[PDB]
Amino acid sequence: ASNFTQFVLVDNGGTGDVTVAPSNFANGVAEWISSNSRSQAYKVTCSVRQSSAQNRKYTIKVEVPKVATQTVGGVELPVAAWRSYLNMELTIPIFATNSDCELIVKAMQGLLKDGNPIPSAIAANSGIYANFTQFVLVDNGGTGDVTVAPSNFANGVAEWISSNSRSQAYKVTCSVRQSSAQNRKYTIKVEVPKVATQTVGGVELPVAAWRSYLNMELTIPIFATNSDCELIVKAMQGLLKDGNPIPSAIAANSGIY
Amino acid sequence: ASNFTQFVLVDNGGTGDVTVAPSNFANGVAEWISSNSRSQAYKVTCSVRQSSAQNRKYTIKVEVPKVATQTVGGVELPVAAWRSYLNMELTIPIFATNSDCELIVKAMQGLLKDGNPIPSAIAANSGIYANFTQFVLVDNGGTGDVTVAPSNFANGVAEWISSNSRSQAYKVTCSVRQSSAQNRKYTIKVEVPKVATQTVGGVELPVAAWRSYLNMELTIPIFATNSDCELIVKAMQGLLKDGNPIPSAIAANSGIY
Amino acid sequence: ASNFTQFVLVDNGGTGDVTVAPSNFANGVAEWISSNSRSQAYKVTCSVRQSSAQNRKYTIKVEVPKVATQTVGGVELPVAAWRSYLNMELTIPIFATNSDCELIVKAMQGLLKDGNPIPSAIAANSGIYANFTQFVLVDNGGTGDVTVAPSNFANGVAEWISSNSRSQAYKVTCSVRQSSAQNRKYTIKVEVPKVATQTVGGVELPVAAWRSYLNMELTIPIFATNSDCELIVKAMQGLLKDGNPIPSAIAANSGIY
Amino acid sequence: ASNFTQFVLVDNGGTGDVTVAPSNFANGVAEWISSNSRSQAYKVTCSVRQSSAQNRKYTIKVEVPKVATQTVGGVELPVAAWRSYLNMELTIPIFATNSDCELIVKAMQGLLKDGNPIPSAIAANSGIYANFTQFVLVDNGGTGDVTVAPSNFANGVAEWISSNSRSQAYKVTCSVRQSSAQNRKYTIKVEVPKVATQTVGGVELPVAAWRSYLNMELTIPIFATNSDCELIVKAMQGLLKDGNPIPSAIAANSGIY
């Protein structure tokens, strides 16, 4: 309920906090503003939309403006010269118990943790970026964890499904390419499956609702570098961080308000 | 660091050692020469090239010239009548711990060991050659080993993924065919996955960077026989042998210099 | 060696034994005759042919003539009014230890055992025939057995891979259809993988040579019935039965002579 | 452990550095970018590619910017007024052993260091330096010299040849040409041979087994004063000397190791 609390997007350390005021957006989505004007601040969207018939989506965008003086006037107009668009339509179950979403929430914070894969990849912007990595999607805590390795490499578009079948494990996809004369994209689809209401496979399973389709389109301009890209990552993880309104909504099978 | 040490390519036994002096090649690659002229010696390349966005490659070639008097002059011109081209663009992770590459290094020496599959196959040149075999890719030592059997046989182009999912195990491919009036090829792709920073699946996994695409194109001329082909194999294994500069580079996520 | 011994094809019980004299066939194949003329007897072929480059085949045919008076003369000409053609190009490894083939031999006798799947299916000719069944391919004996269930059903052409990956388990296929105005076929491909030189996954694996492609084309005429079809099955199992020359060859990675 | 990282290059006295970090490789084309601002960054490329069946070609371009200030529209936009284009294509055959490339690199980079008769042209008036005569270039210890005499210029294309034998001579070019109305392009190719012996037909014909192709196209605008070129040359030649992170790849395994 009303998880609209002013949470810090980028946990830099206290200085220059990208603190974002909640409560906003029109026709079905969410928002979280930072302390500046309508051209240099950070955008943080999050909408709930019943994708199909048994699987509801979660469109969640997050902008990462480059805080630099505009080069089109020579005045003090605060605006970004380029932005790091972060899209992610995370599908999800609904009639399953509350602990099912916790499994998917950790499946988002664990995807971006301090000293982990993607977070330290897209952060250097080059000797590592774009996408395909590994991480225990569900960080349960010593027992019940989900391991997930890789295999195929067709046309440079990978697809990884966990320690189960090619039709019953935590799958994730992606791809990068120079779409035009200036930008690039990170189509990191993270189809997060659900496996809750269970101890360790103790029959009391009766789970419900099938999958999620976390399709992502992270456009990163060629004007970025190492430093500005670590900020892009901190925007992705500071998005789905425990206790924050973005993942907490996705935790109770609920929006925000 | 500077793994450029004179290592013996073919471990024949001391006589006629194909010892190769290191330190060479232009515009991004490596070399290791043998004691002769520029037409009968053995070539041993190895380049590092960031294939995509999160997966860096390892183009590694190795020539196997037939030490026979040239049949185009009747003089003492030392040159090969035919060569056994060995190509292998081995992709790989980078921001993962040093022990991740050890897993992939053994995944190359174990692929060619004394009294094993491929090494005793391509060696007889006929009742066994070309490709598709098995071997514990990662030779850990009694615990944590990776078993990997087979299944499909579509159009004669096999694909084998290990004891996991069709999207999360050690996969490898290949194929052979008479490309022209005189040569043949061994398109032995060995897509080596990574699974490090872990005991035996003890949660402390947090691994990173996805897969490798060790595409291979081993062209073997129809003028070869049993004896000259064992030398071709010893060139493949003496390439990725522990302690040698080729796999040692691939062991520390590094080149040579 | 010289496994050419007079083995009984159909184990009926002693009466009317389809005993077959060995030692025959031209240009690369085998034969086993029964006590009659060149038109009513049973044919039992078996050829060895290095299919590709690392996988050698085993073309094995077996005819099942209907012992009835010819309806084209009214004389005592002994000949079949229709035949049950049994084809099966079983690929296989060679440089692997002798116990690897034992695993594939049992993978043929277990495929057709007394009171099992296929044997009791094609035997009734109707409430059960054609193909897709299950059986522990490798009948080891209490430990190390290979379980294998099913899943897909696309266009009525099934494909079953065992308790491993979709690229590393005992796969098998098939299909039936009215090819023309009078006959039908059983395209029962049994791609038998190999998994030998091992206790129970104890590291000492170092196995070699990849797969087998036991493609089958069992043409059964629409003039058959329940009784004549049990004889068709007994011809398939009496073919790959332990101790007999057909599977014993396939047991030592050898032909017969 | 990560190769292809932030390295060092062109410098002068103690004021501004040029750390060249990584950036892109899409479709096989390495690329390095420097500091914060891309419009003032030092781009550089590198890609492996086997041209045919008896050669190995490369591509290492280089764009050297200018820390200028284009004020258009009242804004001081930090952008380069021009960029360099040191593109060195090098073909190395398979027959050429691992002892030719080491002496090829020191012949391409070891051709234009910081005033050699060819690159002094790239740093001063005498872009010939000598009324264009027999000069010195690539050398090692005391045995063979490489005096490069003059030869042709037909249609605006300088050319230098060495000693007696042309088939073993060191070709080099140079031509002035204003590309448009605000620029001045150039072309300085370089072919480095090999003192080998092609015996075909019973005759020892002294000919090169391969040749280099150091082709540096450089565009210098009219607006760019006579104080930019001096620092451009030491940035093109002063980019690949004898082991720099870019040319060490042209001399060893290390792409940017």
3-state DSSP of chain C: CCCCCCEECCCCCCCCCCEEECCCCCCCCCCCEECCCCCCCCCECCCCECCCCCCEECECCECCCCEEECCCCCCCCEEECCCCEECEECCECCCCCHHHHHHHHHHHHCCCCCCCHHHHHCCCCCCCCCCCCCCCCCCCCCCCCCCCCCCCCCCCCCEECCCCCCCCCCCEECCEECCCCCEEEECCCECCCCCCCCCCCCCCCCCCCCCCCEEECCEEECCCCHHHHHHHHHHHHCCCCCCCHHHHHCCCCCCCC
Query: Are B209 and A152 an interchain contact pair (Cβ–Cβ within 8 Å)?
Result: no
Query: Are A116 and B166 an interchain contact pair (Cβ–Cβ within 8 Å)?
Result: no
Amino acid at B126: S
Amino acid at D57: K
Q: Which of C95, C193, C195 sits opposite B120 (nearest CB)?
A: C95
Cα(C134)–Cα(C149) distance, integer angstroms: 7
Nearest C-alpha of chain B: how many angstroms from C94?
Answer: 8
Query: Are D101 and B31 an interchain contact pair (Cβ–Cβ within 8 Å)?
Result: yes
The per-residue b/e assignment along A174-200, b for 16 or more CB within 10 angstroms, e otherwise, is bbbeeeeeebbbbbbbbbbbbbbeeee
- Of B122, B104, B130, which Cα lies nearest the Cα of B231? B122
Query: Are B156 and C52 an interchain contact pair (Cβ–Cβ within 8 Å)?
Result: yes
Query: Are C206 and B121 an interchain contact pair (Cβ–Cβ within 8 Å)?
Result: no
Nearest C-alpha of chain A: how many angstroms from C92?
Answer: 25
Tokens of D214: 């150091």
Q: Which of C50, C193, C205 sits opposite B150 (nearest CB)?
A: C193
Question: Which sign, positive or negative, has the C-alpha torsion A128, A131, A132, A134?
Answer: positive
Give backbone dihedrals phi and psi of B226, rounded to 5 degrees, phi first: -60, -55
Q: Which residues contact B246 (CB under 8 A, 6 or more apart)?
A: B30, B44, B46, B60, B239, B240
Amino acid at C27: N
Pairing of strands B7-8, B19-21: antiparallel
Cα(D97)–Cα(B41) distance, integer angstroms: 6
Cα(B232)–Cα(B76) distance, integer angstroms: 24
Nearest C-alpha of chain B: how many angstroms from C87?
Answer: 18
Touching A (3+ Cβ pairs <8 A), the chains are B, C, D
Q: How many CB atoms lie within 10 A of CB C65?
A: 21
Q: Which residues contact A22 (CB under 8 A, 6 or more apart)?
A: A4, A5, A6, A7, A30, A31, A32, A245, A256
Cα(D254)–Cα(D257) distance, integer angstroms: 4
- Of D143, D100, D72, D102, which Cα lies nearest the Cα of D248? D102
Amino acid at D36: N
Cα(B65)–Cα(B84) distance, integer angstroms: 7
Which contacts (CB < 8 Å, 24+ apart) does range C44-53 have?
C44/C9, C44/C20, C44/C239, C44/C246, C46/C245, C46/C246, C46/C249, C46/C255, C46/C256, C48/C249, C48/C254, C48/C255, C50/B127, C51/C89, C51/C91, C51/C213, C52/B130, C52/B156, C52/B176, C53/B129, C53/B130, C53/B131, C53/B176
CB-based touch B/A (3+ pairs, under 8 A)? yes
Cα(D37)–Cα(D45) distance, integer angstroms: 18
User: Rounded to the nearest 5 degrees, what angle is found at the Cα of B133, between the Cα atoms of B132 and B137?
Assistant: 120
Cα(B249)–Cα(B232) distance, integer angstroms: 22
**Smallest CA–CA distance from D71 into chain A, residue:** A74
- Report in angstroms the alpha-carbon separations of D112 from A10, D100, D117, D189: 48, 19, 8, 11
Cα(A192)–Cα(B209) distance, integer angstroms: 19
Segments of chain D assigned E as strands: 21-24, 30-33, 43-49, 57-59, 62-63, 70-71, 76-77, 86-88, 149-152, 158-161, 171-177, 185-187, 190-191, 198-199, 204-205, 214-216
Query: Are B48 and D3 an interchain contact pair (Cβ–Cβ within 8 Å)?
Result: yes
Nearest C-alpha of chain A: how many angstroms from C171?
Answer: 15
N- to C-terminal Cα separation, chain D: 10
The CB-side HSE value for C217 (13 A sphere, CA atoms) comes to 5
Cβ atoms of A104 and A92 within 8 Å: the answer is yes
- In the DSSP assignment, the letter for residue A155 is T
Reduced DSSP (H G I as helix, E B as strand, rest coil) percent helix, strand, coil of chain D, to 5: 10, 25, 65
Cα(C192)–Cα(B18) distance, integer angstroms: 41
* Chain A residues near any Cβ of chain D (below 8 Å): 70-75, 124-128, 176-178, 222-223, 225-227
**Can you tell me whether residue D139 is helix, strand or coil?**
coil
Cα(A40)–Cα(A64) distance, integer angstroms: 9
- In the DSSP assignment, the letter for residue D30 is E
Q: Sort out which chain B residues have CB atoms less than 8 A from D98's CB and list them.
A: 20-21, 24-25, 31-33, 41, 43-44
Q: Sort out which chain B residues have CB atoms less than 8 A from D22's CB and list them.
A: 50
**Smallest CA–CA distance from D73 into chain A, residue:** A73
Question: Which sign, positive or negative, has the C-alpha torsion A241, A242, A244, A247?
Answer: positive
Q: Which residues contact C246 (CB under 8 A, 6 or more apart)?
A: C30, C44, C46, C60, C239, C240
**Smallest CA–CA distance from C163 into chain A, residue:** A165
**Residue that is written with structure tokens 């970025």 in the block:** A224
Q: Which residues contact D171 (CB under 8 A, 6 or more apart)?
A: D159, D160, D161, D189, D190, D191, D193, D211
Cα(B240)–Cα(B190) distance, integer angstroms: 14
Q: How many CB atoms lie within 10 A of CB D226?
A: 7
Query: Are A130 and B206 an interchain contact pair (Cβ–Cβ within 8 Å)?
Result: no
Tokens of A61: 């965008």
CB-based touch D/C (3+ pairs, under 8 A)? no
N- to C-terminal Cα separation, chain A: 8
Query: Are D23 and A70 an interchain contact pair (Cβ–Cβ within 8 Å)?
Result: no
**Smallest CA–CA distance from A122 into chain B, residue:** B54
- Report in angstroms the alpha-carbon separations of B143 from B139, B140, B238: 9, 7, 26
Tokens of D11: 């410098």
Q: Which residues contact D152 (CB under 8 A, 6 or more apart)?
A: D159
Touching C (3+ Cβ pairs <8 A), the chains are A, B
Query: Are C167 and B163 an interchain contact pair (Cβ–Cβ within 8 Å)?
Result: no
N- to C-terminal Cα separation, chain C: 8
Query: Are C211 and B132 an interchain contact pair (Cβ–Cβ within 8 Å)?
Result: yes
The CB-side HSE value for C11 (13 A sphere, CA atoms) comes to 12
Cα(A88)–Cα(A41) distance, integer angstroms: 20
Cβ atoms of B193 and A153 within 8 Å: the answer is no
Give Dmax over CA atoms of chain D in angstroms: 75
Cα(B97)–Cα(C169) distance, integer angstroms: 32
Nearest C-alpha of chain A: how many angstroms from C156?
Answer: 20
N- to C-terminal Cα separation, chain B: 8
The CB-side HSE value for A45 (13 A sphere, CA atoms) comes to 20
**Smallest CA–CA distance from D36 into chain A, residue:** A225
Q: Which residues contact D16 (CB under 8 A, 6 or more apart)?
A: D67
The per-residue b/e assignment along D64-81, b for 16 or more CB within 10 angstroms, e otherwise, is bbbebeeeeeebeeebbb
Query: Are D48 and B43 an interchain contact pair (Cβ–Cβ within 8 Å)?
Result: no
Cβ atoms of B135 and C206 within 8 Å: the answer is yes
Question: For residue B69, what is the enclosing H or E element?
Answer: strand B67-69
Tokens of D180: 């448009």
Counting Cβ atoms within 10 Å, is residue B73 exposed (0-12), middle (13-18) or buried (19+)? middle
Preferred mutation among A66, A125, A126, A175 to probe D, highest tally of D CBs within 10 A: A126
* Chain A residues near any Cβ of chain C (below 8 Å): 165-166
**Residue that is written with structure tokens 């697809």 in the block:** A159
Tell which phi-psi region holds residue C94, choosing left (phi > 0), alpha (psi between -120 and 50) or beta. Answer: alpha
Query: Are D249 and B77 an interchain contact pair (Cβ–Cβ within 8 Å)?
Result: no
Tell which phi-psi region holds residue C97, choosing left (phi > 0), alpha (psi between -120 and 50) or beta. Answer: beta
Q: Which of D6, D33, D73 sits opposite A72 (nearest CB)?
A: D73
**Residue that is written with structure tokens 């080596």 in the block:** B192
Tokens of C80: 């079949």
Question: For residue B174, what is the enclosing H or E element?
Answer: none
Q: Which of C95, C170, C203 sits opposite B121 (nearest CB)?
A: C95
Tokens of C143: 């430990």
Cα(A26)–Cα(C224) distance, integer angstroms: 73
Cβ atoms of C63 and C236 within 8 Å: the answer is no
Tokens of D198: 């092609």
How far is C-alpha A50 from the chain's CA centre?
19
Task: Tell me how many helices (H) and strands (E) chain D has.
Answer: 2, 16
Tokens of C50: 């290095």
**Can you tell me whether residue B68 is helix, strand or coil?**
strand
- Of D43, D113, D47, D112, which Cα lies nearest the Cα of D84? D43
Cα(A184)–Cα(B248) distance, integer angstroms: 34
What is the experimental resolution, given in Å to one decimal place? 3.5
Chains B, C: CB contacts within 8 A come to 126
**Can you tell me whether residue D215 is helix, strand or coil?**
strand
Tell which phi-psi region holds residue B112, choosing left (phi > 0), alpha (psi between -120 and 50) or beta. Answer: beta
Cβ atoms of D8 and D245 within 8 Å: the answer is yes
Q: Which residues contact C18 (CB under 8 A, 6 or more apart)?
A: C8, C9, C10, C12, C34, C42, C235, C238
Nearest C-alpha of chain D: how many angstroms from A210?
Answer: 36
Query: Are A126 and D26 an interchain contact pair (Cβ–Cβ within 8 Å)?
Result: no
Cβ atoms of B41 and B65 within 8 Å: the answer is yes
Strand partners, C67: C80
Q: Sort out which chain C residues have CB atoms less than 8 A from A154's CB and list them.
A: none
Cβ atoms of D88 and D216 within 8 Å: the answer is yes
Q: Sort out which chain B residues have CB atoms less than 8 A from A189's CB and list them.
A: none
Q: How many CB atoms lie within 10 A of CB D209?
A: 19
Query: Are D4 and A72 an interchain contact pair (Cβ–Cβ within 8 Å)?
Result: no
Query: Are D23 and A72 an interchain contact pair (Cβ–Cβ within 8 Å)?
Result: no
Q: Sort out which chain B residues have CB atoms less than 8 A from A159's CB and list them.
A: 167
Question: For residue B89, what is the enclosing H or E element?
Answer: strand B88-89
Pairing of strands D57-59, D43-49: antiparallel
Query: Are D26 and A176 an interchain contact pair (Cβ–Cβ within 8 Å)?
Result: yes
Nearest C-alpha of chain C: how many angstroms from A184?
Answer: 34
- Report in angstroms the alpha-carbon separations of A10 from B94, B111, B116: 26, 46, 53
Nearest C-alpha of chain D: how many angstroms from A199?
Answer: 40
Cβ atoms of D32 and D43 within 8 Å: the answer is yes
Nearest C-alpha of chain C: how many angstroms from B146?
Answer: 9
Preferred mutation among D97, D102, D239 to probe B, highest tally of B CBs within 10 A: D97
Tokens of C66: 């209907």
- In the DSSP assignment, the letter for residue A43 is P
Cβ atoms of A147 and A136 within 8 Å: the answer is yes
- In the DSSP assignment, the letter for residue A42 is P
The CB-side HSE value for D248 (13 A sphere, CA atoms) comes to 17
Cβ atoms of C80 and C39 within 8 Å: the answer is yes
Query: Are C54 and B145 an interchain contact pair (Cβ–Cβ within 8 Å)?
Result: no
Preferred mutation among A69, A71, A227 to probe D, highest tally of D CBs within 10 A: A71
Cα(C241)–Cα(C243) distance, integer angstroms: 6
**Residue that is written with structure tokens 């140079």 in the block:** D174
Cα(C61)–Cα(C239) distance, integer angstroms: 9
Chains A, D: CB contacts within 8 A come to 43
